[PDB]
């Protein structure tokens, strides 16, 4: 096999006749149209990917201080790397397998499980052309293939691989990645010291159009938006950390309230004891936040390892597969179980949806939660994510329409909660399009359906930032006063203009519904 640096599992993909079992493509056509190629490639430039080598060398994205560390590969526990895919192309999938095997010591790699989540591509189908399974015969025995007869989704595919894993630790990677050196050693050492740790590698990027390796700029810490999606700590949220954590060492392991992707390593025994995944989550979306919340509340710890780095092809100009439109909403309702009274806020932000969130199985998760002794979401916000803009629902004093009695009209986002457009004044009708909320920790006036969009003195919505350019004070007289200018907002003449503050001018007096949610969120009925 001839192993060594850069080929830790030997020379991969060689036939009996010493020639490669993968015929690689010529250089992409010179007249290629990137927008049309990105579409056909499910988000990546497939002409270029098929032309690149499966044994790609990648730059070492780690800080130089990560190379000064030593790992005794005989004391570390073995791990099972799990890659699940639905119609991932051959070149990107096999490049991932090659990267793992080339860059992972065999002492610490028990196996590499490939989970076909009901792929329909000919090169993967069991009734197909057999290209994949035939090429696997040219790879180490560690590489196994297991299939789901029907496509189950992220959670269904992940659980299949985890259940099939024989090692005490498993590591979940995507089917379109490349690793930096010594990516697994940091994870194993950290999980070895404490089995309750779920350790995430930090993600670098591979451009979808050019396939250049790109340094990841994402920090370690991740919060969440009330739209129920993870979000990196903003500058003003980092500023709220203890001084010793605002700028930690490149080598320090850092906790994170939330997980972004599904790239993490965990002790298999602990993973099942902490609830694994909720196997009634549908297809794609939000399982990372449900796991993040449950993990912390249930005794676990979520950490990121800046010295463990993996490259990831972020899609662009296309998508790799389909997903029902309601699967994302169901996954969000089920995640609200772990948010306790805060679910009322999240429920109003995503439009008060009424869907079949499998209530019968959700009550059983409610019982598992009480039987396990998991902690409240209040504890979560106060201890794991106290840097957020909303630690208690007291931090959202107002939620409802912003009405002006003089002209008899309320604020209206006019159809787009997405920022960049002007706000208007219209006859009040009570729909969510006229509902705004106030985050007092930052003075933000936002539409309830998008906590990333903030009112500005210009009368428009723009991307929220934790700065004085978006700070408002709602006075005891009902005025909307921009703090930087000390001017107040007026609805005079049906247009929105800033004017000298005067509590005697009725055109600048607003009413805003106080927000007094219940101590208990009761789910909507199906």
Q: Say whether 342 counts as a known binding-site residue.
A: no
Q: Which among Mn ion, ligand UDP, none contacts residue 412 (Cβ within 5 to 8 A by kind)? A: none
Q: Which among Mn ion, ligand UDP, none contacts residue 287 (Cβ within 5 to 8 A by kind)? A: none
Tokens read off for 475: 């006075």
Binding site for ligand UDP (CB under 6 A): 84-86, 88, 117, 151, 153-154, 157, 174-175, 261-262, 283-284, 315, 321
Q: Say whether 151 counts as a known binding-site residue.
A: yes
Distance CA(396)–CA(349), nearest Å, equals 13
- Residue number with CB closer to ligand UDP (324 or 351): 324
Q: How many residues does the chain have?
A: 526
Asked whether the beta carbons of 313 and 213 are under 8 A apart, the reply is no
Q: Which among Mn ion, ligand UDP, none contacts residue 45 (Cβ within 5 to 8 A by kind)? A: none
SS3 state at 358: coil
Q: Give the total of residues touching Mn ion (CB under 5 A).
A: 2
SS3 state at 486: coil
SS3 state at 242: coil
Distance CA(91)–CA(83), nearest Å, equals 14
Phi-psi category of residue 317: left, alpha or beta, with phi > 0 → left and psi -120 to 50 → alpha? left
- Residue number with CB closer to ligand UDP (117 or 412): 117
Distance CA(353)–CA(336), nearest Å, equals 12
Task: Verify binding: residue 174, Mn ion, rule CB under 5 A.
Answer: yes
Q: How far is the CB of 121 from ligand UDP (least distance, A)?
A: 11
- Residue number with CB closer to ligand UDP (85 or 482): 85
Q: Say whether 315 counts as a known binding-site residue.
A: yes
Close Cβ partners of 312 (under 8 Å, ≥ 6 residues apart): 174, 176, 177, 203, 204, 205, 206, 261, 263
Q: Say whether 179 counts as a known binding-site residue.
A: no
- Residue number with CB closer to Mn ion (230 or 234): 234
Angstrom distances, CA of residue 183 to CA of 2, 55, 264, 308: 22, 17, 11, 4
Q: Say whether 123 counts as a known binding-site residue.
A: no
Q: How far is the CB of 174 from ligand UDP (least distance, A)?
A: 4
- Residue number with CB closer to ligand UDP (175 or 335): 175
- Residue number with CB closer to ligand UDP (159 or 345): 159
List the one residue out of 279, 286, 298 whose CA is nearest residue 361. 279
Q: How far is the CB of 284 from ligand UDP (least distance, A)?
A: 5
Question: Interhelix angle for 287-297 vs 327-335, to 10°?
Answer: 10
Q: How far is the CB of 115 from ligand UDP (least distance, A)?
A: 7
Task: Verify binding: residue 234, Mn ion, rule CB under 5 A.
Answer: yes
Q: Say whether 334 counts as a known binding-site residue.
A: no
Q: How far is the CB of 256 from ligand UDP (least distance, A)?
A: 17
Phi-psi category of residue 194: left, alpha or beta, with phi > 0 → left and psi -120 to 50 → alpha? beta
Options 231-239, 354-362, 394-402, 429-437: segment touching Mn ion (CB under 5 A): 231-239
Asked whether the beta carbons of 205 and 309 are under 8 A apart, the reply is no
Question: b/e per residue, 91-103, with b = 16+ CB within 10 A?
Answer: bbbbbbbbbbbbb
- Residue number with CB closer to ligand UDP (50 or 117): 117
Q: How far is the CB of 279 from ligand UDP (least distance, A)?
A: 14
Q: Where are the alpha helices (DSSP H) in 138-267?
A: 154-164, 184-193, 235-238
Q: How far is the CB of 264 from ligand UDP (least distance, A)?
A: 12
Q: Which among Mn ion, ligand UDP, none contacts residue 234 (Cβ within 5 to 8 A by kind)? A: Mn ion
- Residue number with CB closer to ligand UDP (314 or 379): 314
Residue number of the CB closest to Mn ion reads 174
Distance CA(358)–CA(340), nearest Å, equals 18
Q: Say whether 193 counts as a known binding-site residue.
A: no
Annotation: binding site for N-acetyl-D-galactosamine: 230-232
Annotation: binding site for UDP: 84, 86, 117, 151, 174-175, 284, 315, 321
Annotation: binding site for N-acetyl-alpha-D-galactosamine: 230-232
Annotation: binding site: 84, 86, 117, 151, 174-176, 230-232, 234, 284, 312, 315, 321, 421
């Amino acid at each position: 096999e001839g192993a060594g640096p850069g080929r830790l599992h030997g020379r991969l993909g060689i036939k009996p006749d010493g020639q490669p079992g993968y015929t690689r493509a010529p250089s992409p056509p010179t007249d290629l149209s990137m927008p049309q190629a990105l579409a056909r490639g499910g988000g990546f430039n497939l002409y270029l990917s098929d032309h690149l080598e499966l044994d790609r060398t990648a730059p070492d994205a780690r800080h130089a201080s990560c190379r000064q560390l030593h790992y005794d590969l005989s004391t570390l526990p073995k791990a099972s790397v799990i890659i699940v895919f639905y119609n991932e192309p051959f070149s990107t999938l096999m490049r991932s397998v090659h990267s793992v095997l080339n860059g992972t010591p065999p002492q610490i790699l028990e196996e590499l499980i490939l989970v076909d989540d009901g792929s329909t591509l000919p090169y993967i189908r069991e009734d197909g052309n057999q290209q994949l399974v035939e090429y696997l015969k040219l790879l180490p025995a560690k590489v196994r293939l297991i299939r789901n007869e029907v496509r189950k989704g992220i959670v269904g595919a992940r659980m299949k691989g985890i259940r099939a894993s024989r090692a005490p630790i498993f590591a979940i990677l995507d089917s379109h990645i490349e690793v930096s050196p010594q990516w697994l050693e940091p994870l194993l050492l950290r999980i070895k010291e404490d089995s309750r740790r779920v350790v995430m590698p930090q993600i670098d990027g591979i451009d979808a159009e050019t396939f250049k390796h790109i340094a990841g700029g994402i920090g370690c810490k991740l919060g969440f938006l009330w739209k129920l999606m993870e979000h990196s700590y903003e500058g003003h949220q980092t500023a709220r950390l203890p001084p010793e954590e605002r700028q930690p060492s490149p080598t320090d392991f850092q906790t994170s309230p939330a997980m972004a992707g599904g790239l993490f390593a965990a002790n298999k025994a602990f993973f099942f004891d902490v609830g694994a995944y909720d196997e009634d989550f549908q297809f794609w979306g939000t399982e990372n936040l449900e796991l993040s919340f449950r993990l912390w509340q249930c005794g676990g710890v979520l950490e990121c390892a800046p010295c463990s780095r993996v490259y990831h092809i972020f899609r662009k100009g296309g998508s790799g597969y389909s997903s029902p439109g309601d699967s994302i909403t169901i996954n969000k309702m089920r995640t609200m179980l772990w948010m306790d009274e805060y679910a009322d806020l999240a429920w109003r932000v995503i439009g008060k949806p009424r869907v079949n969130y499998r209530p019968e199985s959700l009550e059983k998760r409610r019982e598992w939660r009480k039987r396990k002794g998991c902690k409240s979401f209040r504890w979560f916000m106060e201890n794991v994510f106290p840097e957020g803009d909303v630690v208690t629902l007291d931090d959202v004093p107002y939620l409802g329409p912003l009405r002006n009695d003089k002209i008899g009209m309320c604020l209206d986002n006019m159809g787009w909660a997405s920022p960049g457009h002007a706000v208007g004044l219209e006859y009040c009708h009570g729909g969510d399009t006229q509902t705004f909320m106030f985050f007092r920790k930052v003075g933000h006036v936002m539409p309830v359906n998008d906590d990333e969009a903030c009112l500005q003195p210009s009368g428009r919505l723009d991307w929220c930032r934790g700065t004085a350019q978006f700070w408002w004070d709602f006075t005891s007289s009902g005025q909307l006063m921009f703090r930087e200018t000390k001017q107040c907002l007026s609805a005079f003449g049906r247009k929105l203009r800033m004017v000298e503050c005067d509590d005697t001018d009725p055109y600048q007096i607003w009413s805003w519904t106080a927000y007094n949610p219940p101590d208990t969120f009761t789910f909507p009925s199906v």
